[PDB]
Design an enzyme around this catalytic site. Structure first.
Site, PDB file in Angstrom:
ATOM      1  CG  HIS A 124      44.469  76.730  49.793  1.00 44.34           C
ATOM      2  ND1 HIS A 124      44.018  77.084  48.549  1.00 44.34           N
ATOM      3  CD2 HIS A 124      43.383  76.685  50.586  1.00 44.34           C
ATOM      4  CE1 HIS A 124      42.722  77.252  48.595  1.00 44.34           C
ATOM      5  NE2 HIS A 124      42.312  77.016  49.815  1.00 44.34           N
ATOM      6  CB  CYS A 182      38.756  77.099  47.948  1.00 44.25           C
ATOM      7  SG  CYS A 182      39.325  78.804  48.319  1.00 44.25           S
ATOM      8  N   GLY A 192      34.486  78.594  51.903  1.00 45.64           N
ATOM      9  CA  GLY A 192      34.228  77.214  51.556  1.00 45.64           C
ATOM     10  C   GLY A 192      34.071  76.939  50.073  1.00 45.64           C
TER      11      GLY A 192
HETATM   12  C1  LIG Z   1      38.703  79.198  49.988  1.00 39.20           C
HETATM   13  O1  LIG Z   1      37.592  78.608  49.945  1.00 39.20           O
HETATM   14  C2  LIG Z   1      39.742  78.571  50.910  1.00 39.20           C
HETATM   15  O2  LIG Z   1      39.624  77.173  50.999  1.00 39.20           O
HETATM   16  C3  LIG Z   1      38.578  80.762  50.238  1.00 39.20           C
HETATM   17  C4  LIG Z   1      37.512  81.336  49.307  1.00 39.20           C
HETATM   18  C5  LIG Z   1      37.345  82.829  49.584  1.00 39.20           C
HETATM   19  C6  LIG Z   1      36.959  83.155  51.020  1.00 39.20           C
HETATM   20  C7  LIG Z   1      35.843  84.175  50.935  1.00 39.20           C
HETATM   21  N1  LIG Z   1      35.479  84.193  49.525  1.00 39.20           N
HETATM   22  C8  LIG Z   1      36.283  83.506  48.741  1.00 39.20           C
HETATM   23  O3  LIG Z   1      36.207  83.457  47.514  1.00 39.20           O
HETATM   24  N2  LIG Z   1      39.894  81.256  49.882  1.00 39.20           N
HETATM   25  C9  LIG Z   1      40.652  81.870  50.790  1.00 39.20           C
HETATM   26  O4  LIG Z   1      40.267  82.086  51.933  1.00 39.20           O
HETATM   27  C10 LIG Z   1      42.079  82.218  50.370  1.00 39.20           C
HETATM   28  C11 LIG Z   1      43.041  81.174  50.931  1.00 39.20           C
HETATM   29  C12 LIG Z   1      44.478  81.279  50.431  1.00 39.20           C
HETATM   30  C13 LIG Z   1      44.540  81.082  48.928  1.00 39.20           C
HETATM   31  C14 LIG Z   1      45.370  80.273  51.136  1.00 39.20           C
HETATM   32  N3  LIG Z   1      42.474  83.537  50.824  1.00 39.20           N
HETATM   33  C15 LIG Z   1      41.833  84.645  50.430  1.00 39.20           C
HETATM   34  O5  LIG Z   1      40.953  84.648  49.571  1.00 39.20           O
HETATM   35  C16 LIG Z   1      42.249  85.879  51.103  1.00 39.20           C
HETATM   36  C17 LIG Z   1      43.101  86.090  52.152  1.00 39.20           C
HETATM   37  C18 LIG Z   1      43.134  87.485  52.393  1.00 39.20           C
HETATM   38  C19 LIG Z   1      43.803  88.298  53.316  1.00 39.20           C
HETATM   39  O6  LIG Z   1      44.622  87.674  54.209  1.00 39.20           O
HETATM   40  C20 LIG Z   1      45.588  88.470  54.879  1.00 39.20           C
HETATM   41  C21 LIG Z   1      43.608  89.660  53.277  1.00 39.20           C
HETATM   42  C22 LIG Z   1      42.745  90.220  52.327  1.00 39.20           C
HETATM   43  C23 LIG Z   1      42.075  89.457  51.411  1.00 39.20           C
HETATM   44  C24 LIG Z   1      42.274  88.082  51.449  1.00 39.20           C
HETATM   45  N4  LIG Z   1      41.749  87.086  50.676  1.00 39.20           N
END
Ligand SMILES: *[C@@](O)(CO)[C@H](C[C@@H]1CCNC1=O)NC(=O)[C@H](CC(C)C)NC(=O)c1cc2c(OC)cccc2[nH]1
Ligand SMILES: *[C@@](O)(CO)[C@H](C[C@@H]1CCNC1=O)NC(=O)[C@H](CC(C)C)NC(=O)c1cc2c(OC)cccc2[nH]1
Lengths: 282, 290
Positions: B39, B134, B132
């Protein structure tokens, strides 16, 4: 929230073994000096210092309180930026538990108000160090020496000065009665508030002296001015004055949680510092 | 007895920062390949539309040059023109529910903290991850061999976390889209609770022991009633070393747990916990206690 250790790699690169006769323990190799507990001796050519299987020749030595400083003929190329610091009760640090100079595991500890730590150490762990890392600088704060009959642990700073009333002798010693780390419980309450769990907030306040007198009656540590200052950032973030949170905790001490929970628990946590809460919540 | 993570030095040397456009996260640099969440590019059409120069990879201050890229499920693979000299001996593994691993939390390619996690029966983990994080990875270490089992992708609305193995396949029913996703109902890892009760004995806590034994079938009936996973005979065997060291048979410890479930802890603690802890495996206990 969870107990998080610093990454241990900068300290891993500094761990060696020191042997005198048949006694082996762990040493800390920074530039051309190896620091280890002085009781390994229980001349330069009597010390066997090994990095893995490789010997580091000892070219001089000296004693600083309860630590031995071994001068070696090789400067550690993995030496990080570092400081030696003496920590306060209530402060936390990571412990790299080592055996025969080999790192075994890492976990976070807190210095109890009676200068013990509730560690996890087996035979041969002496010389394992505790530390914090701030912007690539490792502040070494603890070198392991002893396990008390109660199972808690005791040691020195890196200048060889024990924390608390302990000595490096093969003698059963007793810690003073422990207390709860008030400043850390308050940081925990702020963490609850930051995450929306705030039923315990009330509309009272207190003076610091009045609160400290009550805290001592519940085996809670009194708050120092330093404690009030390091709670500053969490007070600002939540809009809850530190003395107002003290009044909320005081009601908790005098009335209990009923069946209520804070952060999904019925017991107040006291091994998270105000920094740990900021570290983790941001 | 503490929650103990593996020393993270070997993995720290592999963490890098990957950037594509507006998006930044962490990658894992093994030999001459950088593994990171796909992603970072936000499907197949989308990757085709990208070129090697769209990817910015930084190992500290030094930029690494990308000479190729492919996708493996939810993981992007970036070939770089330099091999990581700090690449440990390693393997990619898919862990089973109940198993534990250490997580190296990183932000902008910089390692930040290390802690122990378990793969929940419902294929989440209860981690500590922020914006950040991920690309952070989970791993186990065996004799200088790092077994990578987890790469971080998302946080559920309930605050637990979801991710993939290093082949890019999610643990559980999750997808790497910006959507609110729920997990299945979780259960407690029975074999791990027993491991931890054995650990509380080895460490001098015994108030919960009793003279009774049970049968495995009868204990499983009560476990299933309290939302505990079934105990298998393989679990009983795996607990053999801990039962041997304490002189308490597994089915005897099961009777203690049954009483704990049916009566509660009565406001007492075990290893300082007021809750039955289930994120220590039998090997974890053995590793720490011996
Ligand atoms: C990454 O670091 C993205 O690079 C991020 C890590 C999380 C953010 C806060 N704490 C974490 O562990 N991951 C995300 O933001 C992912 C991205 C996806 C896989 C493309 N998304 C989520 O974790 C996410 C999105 C949503 C959401 O929307 C609509 C609604 C509710 C929960 C939720 N989690
Ligand atoms: C170091 O490994 C020793 O170099 C060791 C570490 C402890 C072993 C078990 N867990 C540990 O943390 N340290 C010791 O064995 C020290 C050595 C001293 C400083 C010379 N001694 C003790 O920790 C010790 C001695 C006694 C004792 O006597 C008699 C009675 C009761 C407890 C006790 N602890």
């Amino acid at each position: 929230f969870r107990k998080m250790a610093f990454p241990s790699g900068k300290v891993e690169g500094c761990m060696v073994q020191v042997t005198c006769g048949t006694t082996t323990l762990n040493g800390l190799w920074l530039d051309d000096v190896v620091y280890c507990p002085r009781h390994v001796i229980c001349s330069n050519h009597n010390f066997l210092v090994q990095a893995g299987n490789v010997q580091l020749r000892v070219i001089g030595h000296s004693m600083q309180n309860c630590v031995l400083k071994l001068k070696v003929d090789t400067a550690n190329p993995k030496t990080p930026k570092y400081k030696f610091v003496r920590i306060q009760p209530g402060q936390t640090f990571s412990v790299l538990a080592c055996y025969n100079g080999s790192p075994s595991g890492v976990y976070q500890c807190a210095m109890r108000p009676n200068f013990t730590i509730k560690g996890s150490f087996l035979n041969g762990s002496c010389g394992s160090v505790g530390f914090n890392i701030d912007y690539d600088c490792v502040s070494f704060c603890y070198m392991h020496h002893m396990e008390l009959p109660t199972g808690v642990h005791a040691g020195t700073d890196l200048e060889g000065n024990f924390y608390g009333p302990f000595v490096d002798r093969q003698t059963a010693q007793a810690a003073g009665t422990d207390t709860t780390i008030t400043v850390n419980v308050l940081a925990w309450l702020y963490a609850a508030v930051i995450n929306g769990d705030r039923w315990f907030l009330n509309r009272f306040t207190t003076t610091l002296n009045d609160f400290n007198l009550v805290a001592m009656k519940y085996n809670y540590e009194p708050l120092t001015q330093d404690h009030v200052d390091i709670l500053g950032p969490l007070s600002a973030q939540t809009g809850i004055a530190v003395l107002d949170m003290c009044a909320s905790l005081k009601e908790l001490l005098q009335n209990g949680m009923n069946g209520r929970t804070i952060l999904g628990s019925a017991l107040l946590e006291d091994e998270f510092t105000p920094f740990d809460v900021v570290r983790q919540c941001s």
